[PDB]
């Protein structure tokens, strides 16, 4: 009855998350680029992966990084919330950012310190997905962290998701579909931020931008 | 079965374009944004709707505006254009990236050069006029082949002509996915941007 329908809406789910994993893969552009230049209350760092962190590297453009962190702050110890990425593979051999090819995730890391959403009584405060580019449904490689809001590691696979509580059906539409579009859209708004020189016509007014383009 | 697998992939192909609608619903930011920096062999212009056409206005960031055109260049230059018609009115703030976003009247593309065939025919515009209303609405989607403007709900769609999931499949994602990272692009640049020589001297500097 509604026991598949609740199951059907979560397989429509998972194919939204597996098309926000598949954007995130065209983020190893930033891996070479010097990211000098960043949006208000945001850190961007690139490392290597040890476990299940990924270390800041002395050398920011090192080709040899395989996995970047974006830290949101929060102006109200500031530290809102975080995303790691750790890609499968190499950065190439060339060394222009901007031309390097996408790479599939091995792991993805979401930390959430402030504003959490909280699911019937368990706040979610971490995420880790260790299949993000496998297959949609992948719930056996996802763990979720949850705190009493009134230590908590679950695999998704084992969480209920039944007509009275379907407890991964809010989890995946109320919380992490938005979380991995917000956190794609930064990635690429620190791109645009510092790959402008060079890229930009500059004209104050259409009739000026008109001009240019007309031949 | 590969007849019903055949509107299986359709289905799966039209989620993906719901969604892909769904992102450009986000560019009402660019309204009142003053839009200084483009890409280079990029044009963009905010106007009003009239009829099937977007007529440019004389204040850029006039709340009043209602539809958006992106041009593309390379009979001219002009390789391909995109034009977003917002349904409703920009709301009553001034903040440009504060901008809630509305859902879309219609949304046309129309391709000038490097068009893609299908089966012998050249792709030169779409009208989708429902993008924001139901993932299947080929009925609302009309489709124009090198005069020759086809509703898709009436095009061939089997194993062996599959004409719909080829046009969907092959052309008009990876189209809907470029016209988005571009508005969004343009966006981000004008962010960023507060005196020019100064900025990308400061952008140097770092």
Not at 84 to 95: K, L, R, T, V
């Amino acid at each position: 009855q509604l026991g598949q329908s609740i199951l059907e809406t979560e397989r429509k789910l998972d194919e939204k998350i597996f098309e926000l994993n598949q954007r995130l893969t065209r983020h190893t552009v930033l891996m070479k680029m010097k990211v000098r230049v960043l949006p208000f209350r945001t850190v961007l760092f690139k490392g290597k992966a040890n476990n299940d962190e990924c270390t800041p590297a002395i050398n920011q453009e090192d080709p040899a990084n395989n996995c970047i962190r974006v830290e949101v702050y929060d102006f109200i110890g500031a530290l809102a919330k975080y995303m790691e990425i750790y890609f499968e593979g190499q950065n190439s051999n060339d060394p222009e950012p901007r031309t390097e090819p996408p790479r599939n995730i091995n792991k993805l890391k979401s930390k959430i310190y402030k504003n959490n959403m909280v699911l019937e009584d368990k706040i979610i405060s971490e995420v880790m997905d260790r299949g993000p580019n496998t297959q949609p449904s992948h719930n056996d490689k996802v763990e979720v962290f949850f705190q009493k809001d009134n230590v908590g590691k679950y695999i998704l696979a084992g969480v209920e998701n039944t007509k009275t509580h379907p407890i991964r059906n809010s989890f995946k539409k109320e919380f992490y579909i938005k979380h991995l579009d917000q956190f794609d859209r930064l990635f690429t708004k620190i791109f645009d931020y510092n790959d402008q020189l060079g890229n930009e016509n500059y004209k104050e007014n259409v009739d000026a931008l008109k001009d240019s383009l007309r031949y």
